[model samples]
Target: ADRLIVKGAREHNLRSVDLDLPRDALIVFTGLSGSGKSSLAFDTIFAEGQRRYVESLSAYARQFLGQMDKPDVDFIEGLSPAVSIDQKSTNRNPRSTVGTITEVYDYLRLLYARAGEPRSFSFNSPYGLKPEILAVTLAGESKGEHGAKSIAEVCELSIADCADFLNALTLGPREQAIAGQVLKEIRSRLGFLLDVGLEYLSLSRAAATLSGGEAQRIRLATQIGSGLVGVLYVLDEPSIGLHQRDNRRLIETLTRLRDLGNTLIVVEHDEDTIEHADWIVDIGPGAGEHGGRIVHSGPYDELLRNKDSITGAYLSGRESIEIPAIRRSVDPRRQLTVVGAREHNLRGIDVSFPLGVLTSVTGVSGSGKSTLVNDILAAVLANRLNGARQVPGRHTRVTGLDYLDKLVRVDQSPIGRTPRSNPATYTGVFDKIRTLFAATTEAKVRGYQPGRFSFNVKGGRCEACTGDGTIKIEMNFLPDVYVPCEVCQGARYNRETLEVHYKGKTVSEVLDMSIEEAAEFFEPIAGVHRYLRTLVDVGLGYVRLGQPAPTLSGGEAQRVKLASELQKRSTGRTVYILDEPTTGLHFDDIRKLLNVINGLVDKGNTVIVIEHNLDVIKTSDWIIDLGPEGGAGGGTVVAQGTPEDVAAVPASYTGKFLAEVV
Candidate 1:
């Protein structure tokens, strides 16, 4: 009776699908990227629910709101008012702070207006007596001497510290009576923020400054505070930027929301989150055209019994990322040491980064791991060695620059912005492929060169579409539409170029083949084979050789860069810096990533990663755990040694979690 019935849900890649999902339950929708989990959860269910609600509103009100189109579905029953909590960032206005976004500041202003004296509370009151700006004096005094901190001073403190001060503050009996309810509301909302591992954030911290993960967590707190019931809440990957130590608290918060007579449909890939769900709806037998079916829809235990479920295979231990048999030994003599490093929230601590090994910089969120490695260490190295104009974080001296030759920083930035850029072009492999095509018997006789094989130039490509397979149609107020070129029939080449063949396959046909297939087909050529082999090694066998860069996920884009690096001859003196390379990967994919990076360290290069994945942490040769806490209380090195050495430390929050794994 309390089930949401979805029938004929044909949105996106989703086939005519039917599902009966229970109300007031924590349900997880999981699949490979492009396997239609999002199509079912967000597109069909959430879209239909939102559209129904919007249709009931007046035309005037509807005009102001973003339009929700009716989803392509037959019908839905027992649907509730739906809300989606996605990974999109919060407001960009610097005026909007964490406190204001969550309405904690709204309550604070109300309490101050009602109970506190006028002069102390009014932030914007332009009175005749313009008081001296004491903030400058406070900073000078704080530098030289200790003084009683003001409320404004406390506001600048971390949220955790501010909460403690608020709790400790004493009020007059009359004042307490007027603000008691408001104080409770403020504290409880703050408690929700803390529960979501946002204790490191300050109330005055600008919304624009927050990461996508931090912004989402703030919104999550606001929703939990709303106390809404009989609602269907659909969430994207909530653990995107969270540390493993804080993940437990997030799960608790999600469960609490479900227990409050609501349904939660979480589309996620995290193993920990999947294991905790009451029911699981696993989509796909493969990705894109190969997938769309509900391969399994049952309890976690039941999923393990289903042979077709790829997720089940990974979860049931049929497939797993094995720990490295022997962790790489570090060379103490070949180390780069940062002296007196003082970045944002860093405690002016000195640290040594051992060379010729894979090192992990671990911490709770905002615990200065990025400040120590990315801002200070990588920035300084890139500036000095790479000859780039970069201003590093505050640091006195960095020793052992003479030991390394250069720096290579790989991040999850998109490889290209347009379809004109593809894997073949970005990796410089397409040039070799085009050369091979020019060397073909038919091309040589036709007097066609390597340029004749390229889609970018005019020689051998379709002029009507300008060598682009698709033509873009501009829409006035909607997303632009892309249709296949009628003249080329989605092929980038002209009739003459298409007639020329390489080993019986046309140039476009070869580009359409998967990397795995191309690796075998081009095995005879060492230069072409090397790049394809690396792509396969990085678990990107399914991706096409000429797949548009814009179509790649963040994780895919990162691995592509990794593959690009792997094909290059290493100097053995280069430092490789990576920032969370496992952002959007599956468990199976993570195994492949670890192998590839470990291969890099074996080549005598230094690899330092800023990460939160336990599997990655467990495999590292060295560990530098930052922060006993985050924000103001963080920046000092709590633990630095092997994973075993870090697990033994009582002060490290990372150690507390590392102990369970290592």
Candidate 2:
């Protein structure tokens, strides 16, 4: 009655594993990234269920279903219909909101249509109803300047204020009777947001403006409200951007779904979320080639007892990231200060950041951390230093302009969107490798140049696939498929190019080696090794030199940016800005990543990071904690000091989490 069986499951990195999962339970797959947790949860289980479901449809409908490929599994039994809630945000509209996405706004319109506005409540109109009037109506007030003001004035208020205003409304008996049922539904929908720790959000806050965690929580809350039963929901890293206080609320929401007669399979790395699971499937002894096998699969307590699981070692306190014994001293004279900073929710606050140290801008979700750092600080500096025209957030003036010469925002945007762009090409190491190939004796006799070795040009690249290594096949109404090119067998280069050897290795052969291997292979060549070593230093040793840029994860792409900067000559005066750099890192990898970040600071570069990971925050030289709350309630800095200094403050929500870590 309560089992889903999987036999001979082998998808991407996953070793053949037979698993029996209990239905109506919260199951978490925990491990290092690339340890097959996602391979097992998403690629295998969810893939199989989706394939079976779509295959059940009629042929006409199946043509539009995008050709569901089955997972590499012999069998899966008792598998119910599957739903995947991935991390990628599909909507990019500015007008969409938590209320709109949850369909709560529709009910609000229904309420207004029947009782309040008659025909004036058209949100899709050329001149929609004013938000100020809605605020006045919700307040049960019908006079003065409220009805005459524009909607922007009311959109500025937080959702909590909206809830409070709604609660205190003094509606007349006739109107109350008419709108009671609709109001009930709206309040219950709003209650879902409150339960998920998003009371800080305003109904007018654009969906694009919300952080990843905030958006995910809104969807999570909406799913619980749907009350769907016996459905299998697979989620990928829902805890990526959560604060510890809000993490508890997210956990509670997941369990609520589990208790409602559904099965939840989540792939997460957060310690607290893993600890709360009804079942924990821990993968790997390490990442990449060493990983794939399920090391531990049972109750949380049992996982802690298992010696093989690396995640277990960290959870049981046998291993942990240590706090630095001494933080970098802040110099008052060498600081960059932004005066009268009033952007988004920031309340015209004057904030100063210490130069030449790893500083963290910390906060709860929607607390103006990114608004302050990214929108204002990074934008202004990019315009000034890089000679770009970009309007920054409204600020009076910025002092300490002489302290920096260059500004680098090492964000998580993909280095290149197509398969033609790989790690070697982006880092400029491929140019050097091509030059070396041209210098070889075989190339000297044939009269080949560096351009001949490049896959981008026509001379030496495989013509059949045009150097893409894979041929794209259009499957009519089905999704496009990629198959290896028959002529070169995925070598990406023509036979003439393969014949030329540099130091007894072909150019194509060099691209196939991992960064770790390339580091050792190219050690004698100072120019090439310098760049390759930096890639390895940033915990990307496992990544291949020719790996497609689009295939890299957000965290991996960020580190690639860091590595690219490292390869350049040190400007000491340069300032590096990173946002949520630890998005997809494991504990072991984070330690390695932190070492390189500290190295950058040690080299006299100013590093400012926007982060929520307690481990990364605890190690920072300084902390800027925004928000005693979020939205209208948050903007001013609640606390700014050392981790220990922030920990002592009771008003700071981040402090509450930092206290335990510090």
Candidate 3:
């Protein structure tokens, strides 16, 4: 109780909360998506800890400190240094790797440098560095029968030419000695890599090329190796993008971190993760504005006894919903085909997805799910249909499949990056608002510029945050943190800019309003209001107009993206590919999302979703289940048919689970 005490916290929708949390325990934050778990655990508590940490530094150092606003709270005590390992991607640097991040390879590098024989070695070369034997071979190649040349003469040869000759030689005594040393170094490094579950270290490869789950694992591995003690580690849905089997490994790693005397806080929805928690804090009866209250907080066993609690209902196995019988048929002839997809881990797959109905592609994590969906299906379809034609011969290698007139990929990637890019901008409703503002009589009387109302431009924005409305503090050796700008008090405008109101509200005030609120406020503007209503219908009424896309959850972001694309009303019998649309979604939200997707199908479009949620699988018209397990253990199509037909397949785990759920 003495460690990490949060008192009278009121950030966001958090209602004057007070709690005493124990340090060094694995504390799991459980709730429906957007139930203010993040606001309490991250926005209020973590932000306060971070702010205080920054304040402890000297002014000169504080200047570089992230400009975190003080949390809306009375007091907090017994806080430790915090480390957040959220679902954010690893650094974009091409050279970073799993080994480097974990510092395991660094130790290997140092070990080889210090202990190896003939060890005055360089890590430079096209394929790392040459062993002493390889160097000797280079010298011998220049001096032997091929040419009357010395070692110096070989050195004069182009580096490229020497490499070719050196590659052909066998090891002699001096060469053998050097080879032994190099082998020893490699063996040592390999041992370290293997200890951490990495088979090999591909140093030249870029981190961006890794799959989402693989990248998350690599990040987790790095933090585990840090050996930091008594630090509060916050992770957001660490199990995301991992297979059910891989989730076990992730859980083990998290347990190990907790065992190392670190306090761990994770915002997660996975049932497997929840089962493993030392303490559970369930914070919601629903999502968004309807949530924020702590419905239950205790050990998992005690929480399960609270029958009224949603978390309890789910955890106690009382909320299991039966999978519906597949109502639609897959017309064998009407194939949604993808041919010869060689992108990423696709393995040259030539496959067909059923058309004009829900076709679910179920696969283990990284078993070519994305490669098939995003890289092959969506990319090919987008190129073919969106008027951005690919060169004819370029796609010839990936031939076969009837080209669709349209394709939409609705995944959980952010809709936009900054405050300037909100639901308004994304939905294209802002253009109509701009026109309305420009045509206003007040604008004509004052000779106000149309640009005056624009927050993205300089004239109307708070000069402090440059319309970003938030300031980021760059911490040395740590991740940067964002805090609301003090100068404009997060309004994104100065006093002078506030004076120029579009109606009764300033531009910042309007931006702060939710899309639902905006729909009613701009009721007179039919075009703008209609688009805003579409957002509300998509279940994004809780999302603020100016909330940064970066802040949105994957599910929220995906729905917003779907809303944007829906507003476009593109032509033709389009094929839409969604990857686990139900990920991070509550069952209720998932049902709503299903309705939106069904709407697309009703309009004569084909909707293909890759999902694992039983509810989603049950509703699927056709099911293509691809796994008995994950990694090398999985890749082949385990079963393919209608959901009911797939359930009869004895070999498919998905089919068996589907049958059981139903």
Candidate 4:
């Protein structure tokens, strides 16, 4: 009911920010991946609110509530109860389904209890058990085996012994009859549950059987069913695994939540979601340390007019990219082939991928893109190439070309396990750099070792945080908080280590620099410089060398991984698989990514990208378009050819969109 005000907030690299946000408004936070948008919106504002709320409760009660640390801010005002629907998966229970998640089954259960056929039905089973009737039936079959026998005769014991055994088991004739009747009642309830959208519900199924989008939607349904109100709803890229069509439904749900008088704050990159925001807070001039300042904030239209804003530049169509014509007769040789594949919603399909060419697999959400590309294609290829089937699910297909030089899956998975793993370690440049340090004249003079350059090791790292530039504080059941380590004061190394300079900079200093900066800084060091330059070439110059991999957006993380793979100059027709590689990337960023993929193709490797971005589809050497719709409505190959040919196909959804783009 009151304004939410934040003043002099200095969380992360934020520049003493001050802002007033309206309560119950749908506010969108926009930025190039690592700008201070998350810090300002989540770290400072939401965090302070949570801390205050927790502090208001008694310590005993507060223990049940997750711990919350105070934010580095002057003040915050007019906060309310909050809920966050992040990109994380929702279903932990194998039996969790659309019906159970939406509470439609629960509603159906109540409906059947109050109004339905079979008046002898009982609402509650003996002990809230399900499939109760099935249990009773099994019990009856066991009892019936001893036909015409008294309880004592069936047990082969005296009457007193039979009575004692019944008392211990807590069973009698009356209880048995009641249990049987309750089981029948449960069976009746199961029918009602099935009728209300839970047709395929079964407890024996594995949770991993559900698609990524299905998992995300089920999570969303559970949050909505919670019936919580007057809370701030924070979401982090909720559209991660959703198809373009399903994304619309997700947007509608978000809008409904906003209209319900709840304050919505979403850190998102999807244009569809951004366009629909009531208010926009754009934070960035660039990513990583170059970012963190709020460039513009207000209605989308106003933000669009702000010349200095990158978000505005894209939204206002300032940077238009020319889509290159698809390569004709691109690599006639079939490097990877799928024959009669029928994996999870995929219609019996066959397709071939060309060697030494860039290919894009396009389709709407739930249209079996993942089934064909990630599930069937990647699994078969991975198993064939590596002789190992790591991915779950049964593949009902045969494939040739099991042996390749290498099969690199350059996905968006975070490269490092901790903050210690960064661009240097990921690209394998750090080892070479450490080698250089070991070979240095300074090391010879002081008897310094190679491990001395490693922050993970003893001598080179800061004693306070043990080489990590930041300190992590455990919050028990709550999300842990990370702050700059006090020992090294965020330098990541001790004074002794900092003094050991290579190319006039310590290892920590080099790690702190951006890839572009490092490339120039280590120009004399050929191996390190070249590898770091590859990272810069892939449009990751804005990212810091020491930035935690966990903090990276999906797109940024993918590029980092791609850069790592590019460093390995393998000589063969290797197959590179990527899923939604354009995710979270700006069009400019996408151009750079396309260049990276094109480079791989040029290197005599086949690059197969599972993408939905129209630009990517247009620029691809070959296009494999699947679907006219999504879910069960789509599975077959609608079109496949040069981008131009696919664009002309009237029945292809991808073709229609590509036609518009081209």
Best by lDDT: 2
Clashes of each: 0, 0, 2, 2
The deviation in Å at residue 86 for candidate 1 is 3.0
User: What are the candidates' C-alpha RMSDs?
Assistant: 5.3, 3.5, 7.8, 10.2
Q: Model 2, 472-521: lDDT tens per residue?
A: 76655433556668898878889988989888888788887778788899
Q: TM-score for each prediction?
A: 0.82, 0.89, 0.80, 0.79
Q: What is the RMSD of candidate 2?
A: 3.5
lDDT of 1 at 311: 84
The best-first sequence of candidates by TM-score reads 2, 1, 3, 4
| lDDT against the true structure, each candidate | 0.75, 0.76, 0.64, 0.65
Give, for candidate 4, the lowest lDDT window spanning 10 residues: 144-153
In TM-score terms, which candidate is top?
A: 2
Which of the two, 3 or 4, has more lDDT? 4
Better of 2 and 4 by lDDT: 2
Residue 532's lDDT within candidate 1 is 89
Residue-by-residue lDDT tens digits, candidate 4, 215-238:
654555566556577888787666
lDDT of 3 by residue, 1-662 (tens): 54666678777767776776677888888776667877788877676666667668787666665444567888778888866666566567655644455544444343333322222322333434344423422342343211112211221122213322342253355545545454344344333333333322243235775655457657666666555888788887666666454466667767876787877888777777788888888775776667767777778997899875776887687875444444655667777555555544344445667766777877565565655566555666667766565432112233334535666778777777666677767777666665666676665676767666666778767898877777877667446667778888877766665665577666677778877678789888778777887787788887788787667777788888888888877554777778676666655567677777777777767788877676787888888877554433445577888877788886886787777755
